[PDB]
Structure 1
Amino acid sequence: DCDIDKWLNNFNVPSPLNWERKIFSNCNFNLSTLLRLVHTDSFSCNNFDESKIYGSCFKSIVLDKFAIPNSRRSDLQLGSSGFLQSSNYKIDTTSSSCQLYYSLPAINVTINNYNPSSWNRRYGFNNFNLSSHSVVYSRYCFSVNNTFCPCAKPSFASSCKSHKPPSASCPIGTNYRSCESTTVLDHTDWCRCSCLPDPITAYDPRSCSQKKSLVGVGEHCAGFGVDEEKCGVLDGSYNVSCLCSTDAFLGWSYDTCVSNNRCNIFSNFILNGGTTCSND
């Protein structure tokens, strides 16, 4: 009694940004029933015969589910490299898996928009101020070290005459934003800082502390890039904590999951290897 269909039909549905995983084992299931208790649009298998599911046993079955943005369903085609499959949830191509596309009535479905990135939350990310059925996905993912801090040192900023950066105190153990004082003709304290104008379109990606990255199999987005010109305050001090504003967080967007008054949801079934038998 795996009860996969109840999990799939749970009206608390994650956005691609924070897809959820559940493992079903030491239980029985029936695929024919499973695909009837959920409004299935499509079901197909990759490097695995669908017809061989019936009567077979697996070591375990692992399901990863999330809401699908109206505009990006095609991004979930295997081998694609857009946003959903590269910055949110990568679909494996070497494991035996089946992809289930189904929908739940919009009037009941609630989307859980949550940013799983600890370094974003650490520096001021809170929540998403979005309407119902809005599904958040990442467009670019950035990784940082455990010493990352987006604010300039108050002592440095205090000496700037031109392009004076935002500054604030940083958590113990981290380093301050990398900046230097230059001269551009008769300009003498012209402050030059990294990740300009921003980590996504930065003119020099090597000078920035925020590295782009893609998500591999079984892992979430590293985090949203931060506009380090919006973190901390101008003419700041050690009496203020390095916190970023809400519009400092870049590289993300959202769409709605609504068609015929239903929310489209993706669920990837991973067949591993047992006792997890389909006695259908």
Structure 2
Amino acid sequence: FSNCNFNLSTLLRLVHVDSFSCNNLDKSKIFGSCFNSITVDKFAIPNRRRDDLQLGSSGFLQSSNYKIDISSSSCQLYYSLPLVNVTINNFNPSSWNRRYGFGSFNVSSYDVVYSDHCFSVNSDFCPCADPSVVNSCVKSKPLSAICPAGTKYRHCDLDTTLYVNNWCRCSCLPDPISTYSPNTCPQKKVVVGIGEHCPGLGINEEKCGTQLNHSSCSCSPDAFLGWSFDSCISNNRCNIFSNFIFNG
């Protein structure tokens, strides 16, 4: 919201406020001054993780969903909304999960899908194994398909046991949440920054593929892991967080 006029009293009585703190500011210094823009960022709140949002904290929501910056002259609002007509949009913001077949979540009508870990990959990522290598494997042989163009394959070895010679061993085991060798799986775990989205849910690397028709490399809906939810509805009213940033 830039280049316009506003106040506060019609605002905070026209939306059902439950709190309005501030930080780096005094609550009456809004009423006089003339800023340069305002940047309101809103989202709903999952109920049992509401205490993630303390100003300058650890947790899930401030670390892998939306990091509340503790430097500018922000002012945080916690309001409510009647649940007559409320349709929570639940869409995934990452490119490389919808590229590998992320359709949707199954949650209820009023459940908000937050995040736990947020893993980042490169541009040439391909979570399927190499099918022209994998046929001579016998032990631990994974599913595979053909990657799209330029996406380099997953690194899979047929290294040698004490007796068996072609037994499969790839990277990213068992799941990249709890991998044994973190310095080798391409899905690197990163913490989200100020004003960024969670760059992708983690893919379990061993549910992405089939055996016979090695098509373009897709995945399967059980394999995206690292998200949970809860219901926003408390006191018959879906609570909502919303930030403000009073820059300039």
Please give the per-residue CA displacement for 1:230-270, whole angstroms capped at 9, x wherever unaligned. 0011x3454x1211111110111111101111011111000
Distance 1:237-1:155 versus aligned 2 partners, 3 A rule:
farther
- Which of 226, 244, 247 is 1:269 aligned to? 244
Give 2:109's aligned residue. 132
- Whether 1:252 aligns to 2:227 is yes
Structure 2 counterpart SS, 1:54: helix
Tell me how far apart the structure 1 counterparts of residues 175 and 235 of structure 2 sit (CA, whole Å): 39
Please give the per-residue CA displacement for 1:30-75, whole angstroms capped at 9, x wherever unaligned. 1111111111111011111111000211100001100000111110
1:26-175 alignment runs, 5 A limit? 26-175=3-152
- Which of 198, 205, 218 is 2:175 aligned to? 198
Give 2:208's aligned residue. 231
Q: Which amino acid aligns with 1:36?
A: R
Q: CA RMSD in A?
A: 1.0
Q: Which amino acid aligns with 1:107?
A: V
Structure 1 counterpart SS, 2:6: coil
Structure 2 unaligned regions, length at least 5: none
Tell me how far apart the structure 2 counterparts of residues 209 and 66 of structure 1 sit (CA, whole Å): 30
What is the aligned-residue identity percentage? Answer: 73
Q: CA deviation at 1:105?
A: 1.0
Q: CA deviation at 1:129?
A: 1.7
Structure 1 unaligned regions, length at least 5: 1-23, 274-280
Q: Is the 8 A contact 1:180 1:193 kept in 2?
A: yes
Tell me how far apart the structure 2 counterparts of residues 38 and 174 of structure 1 sit (CA, whole Å): 48
State TM-score, norm by structure 2.
0.98
Q: CA deviation at 1:79?
A: 1.7
Structure 2 counterpart SS, 1:104: coil
State TM-score, norm by structure 1.
0.87
Q: Which amino acid aligns with 1:251?
A: G
Q: CA deviation at 1:151?
A: 0.3
Structure 2 counterpart SS, 1:86: helix
Tell me how far apart the structure 2 counterparts of residues 206 and 158 of structure 1 sit (CA, whole Å): 27
Tell me how far apart the structure 1 counterparts of residues 148 and 58 of structure 2 sit (CA, whole Å): 36
Give 1:18's aligned residue. none
Give the length in aligned residue pairs: 248
- Which of 168, 186, 203 is 2:163 aligned to? 186
Tell me how far apart the structure 1 counterparts of residues 212 and 155 of structure 2 sit (CA, whole Å): 16
Q: CA deviation at 1:106?
A: 2.0
Please give the per-residue CA displacement for 1:94-119, whole angstroms capped at 9, x wherever unaligned. 11100000010123211110110000
Q: CA deviation at 1:179?
A: 1.1
Q: Is the 8 A contact 1:75 1:82 kept in 2?
A: yes
Please give the per-residue CA displacement for 1:148-179, whole angstroms capped at 9, x wherever unaligned. 00001111111111000111010101111111
Q: Is the 8 A contact 1:166 1:236 kept in 2?
A: no
